[PDB]
Design a protein around this ligand. Sequence first.
Ligand SMILES: *CC(=O)N1CCC[C@H]1c1cccc(OC)c1
Length: 185
Amino acid sequence: SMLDDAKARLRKYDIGGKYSHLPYNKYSVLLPLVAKEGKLHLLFTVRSEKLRRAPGEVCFPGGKRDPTDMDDAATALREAQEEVGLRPHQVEVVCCLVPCLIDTDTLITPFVGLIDHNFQAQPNPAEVKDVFLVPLAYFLHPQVHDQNHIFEYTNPEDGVTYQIKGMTANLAVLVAFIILEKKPT
Ligand SMILES: *CC(=O)N1CCC[C@H]1c1cccc(OC)c1
């Protein structure tokens, strides 16, 4: 099936806990995969304009590890619940992708999660101004604008354009390559 095939592909890139104990300032993100209309999509947030760090930017759900978290995956799931109302029974964490090193002292660990078909986002306006889907296939043929490369995605439902860039854009392309490369039509 589409979903079994995606999970099987993703598992080949799982680093698991290999980098998880290193003494960094630790953050996790969830890359949430949603199946709609026979195709996979990624779920993105737009950060609230009132936040200190990166107001109004397109990001994945996530945030800083706290003492309650059993592991890095728990961080991602806790933050996703707080930001968009995703409950743990509504997500299957499939794998942990290559971490992202920044600022010399920070390690961001991305987890890919398959999202239940009955989940409906409830954006928390203290954290997130918007939540939206992009088809995974978009990231194979994006609309690129240079400012460094920025992706512009226009939602055909409403005509709204979102700008996706940096780590977030790079991770989206990675997931699209992993799942969609070399597939019969
Ligand atoms: C958009 C984005 O992913 N950002 C904004 C702040 C830095 C980065 C980030 C890094 C780790 C966790 C985040 O939580 C979503 C965000």
